[PDB]
């Protein structure tokens, strides 16, 4: 009798639920209605919203709630990636019910389902708006009335793949999804003290809930596998002297037996084509044609963005292969492996239903003494890999640093002048690099830093390049003339916002706006994703992403935003790291944080700030010097990627 136990549990609350016409959000909306709450459901398709509303209202009357027809409302055409539309959703909800007590940030899309090195930047941005920026947007508009009335709750529906406190969990090929789920948890952790005690804010993070989905995902896996084998062989041939752009006409002949027996093909490509013709299912054209159209366009994108070829070297496929490319048998073999992976994660060997998760969640929502937590209503999972955030302990080995002699360094930054200059001086004077290229945002910063190091600049050992925000272009320019990188160190162009996070009394003009939160995600998360996207394609690069310090004022709000940035970015660094471990060119990714775990640990004297800068140098070095590949150490290649090191 679960309905009987729900009765009156949330009597008189008004809940807004996004993505509320099916799945978990439909069940939470259903069970909140069955607990006496007025619910507004929001999704895109209006008829589904109508059918779910019908079903719920019927149950509400059977439960003997008064005037059941007026207890459920719908609001169609609500795409949570459309941040400006959420305002009309809220306006309508306050208009219909008078107030919002519960905000259930439930809607969540799957994202791009590509590796970091393949992800279109605007697909990344779209996932983050839908899964992450939507949640602050709704919270920020509702928080004033919620603070006023005081019985209020924000619930972000996150995931185990958004990690846990101080721990990131890599989700290969899903970095956008993982970053938005981590960011939902991070928002809960970072805001709870400012929104309390009137607003509780928590996340839930269910485990897995119950052509099919494993079929689409299996197909992507087979396509990715083929694309990686070709990219790898292309690099191994370019390694032996081949010019990649000149192999493209013959390669895009697409015939596997042609490529395998061409003397005009470098040996790597021939060994790959031989294996393919011998292993791939013969009932598919994949055994006779190298690539389909998707593989081809992505292969060219990896080569153009990695700087291996130019726009003029782009070729269409001579012959688009005939379906079926991958046979149904291959796709099923791989989908069963996907499914078994997921199922084997689970300690209980069974999955919850959407109703189960909803039920536990709706009970959880009745507890009034918990905030800033991540509740698992479904749970019990063993993960392939977890990465704890940590603190720098030790120094890099001399041998590894010597391997940096003569390399080219790319620095990306703007406002952290002292850090950038110290990095450059260290790389040139003590590491003996060939040269340091600095990519700034504004021209002025380029000129000032070129001045403070005018000596190295005259000698050609320091270069500056103002990007005016065009990160991809600067890396292409630098690669074109100033040398191909080893160490790449991305720092943020912009500082953290100096904004409040909660009201002083009933004044909210000073609290971080939705647009400002959007800018924060752009400049402290997407900025580094753009760097990692390009540099992950560069054979022989190392990537380090640096999260910003606080200002001298060092306000609690600023500290909260820094920890938000650190937690959210780590999901990217860990997923990029796990991807590197599996796919050539195995470019490592690691993260360095300039804000400490606890606020009392921040430097308070100039001597302590000197200790920090020294440590910062040592961590950037520890992650910049050549790291072990999977071939040298299977263990060390795993653990020396995906870290977040506080200094
Ligand atoms: N294995 C799991 O299912 C699992 C586990 C952990 C976490 N989660 C999280 O749980 C949440 C819901 O998962 P689910 O499996 O129930 O999702 P789902 O199957 O995609 O649920 C679909 C619901 O969301 C709506 N929706 C879809 N795209 C939308 C968009 N762009 N804007 C607004 N509404 C949209 C749909 O209506 P329309 O399509 O008509 O708009 C419908 O109401 C997500 O945040 C997800 O990350 C799920």
Author numbering: 573 to 782, 793 to 1229
Paper text:
Malonyl-CoA reductase (MCR) is a NADPH-dependent bi-functional enzyme that performs alcohol dehydrogenase and aldehyde dehydrogenase (CoA-acylating) activities in the N- and C-terminal fragments, respectively. It catalyzes the two-step reduction of malonyl-CoA to 3-hydroxypropionate (3-HP), a key reaction in the autotrophic CO2 fixation cycles of Chloroflexaceae green non-sulfur bacteria and the archaea Crenarchaeota. Full-length RfxMCR was a homodimer of two cross-interlocked subunits, each containing four tandemly arranged short-chain dehydrogenase/reductase (SDR) domains.
The crystal structure of RfxMCR-C in complex with NADP+–MSA was also determined by the molecular replacement method and reﬁned to an Rwork of 22.05% and an Rfree of 25.28% at 2.3 Å resolution. In the substrate-binding pocket, MSA was immobilized by hydrogen bonding interactions with Ser731 (3.0 Å) and Tyr749 (3.2 Å) from the SDR3 domain and Arg799 (3.5 Å) from the ED. NADP+ was coordinated in the cofactor-binding pocket through extensive hydrogen bonding interactions with Tyr749 (2.6 Å), Lys753 (3.1 Å), Ser593 (2.7 Å), Arg616 (2.9 Å), and Asp651 (3.2 Å).
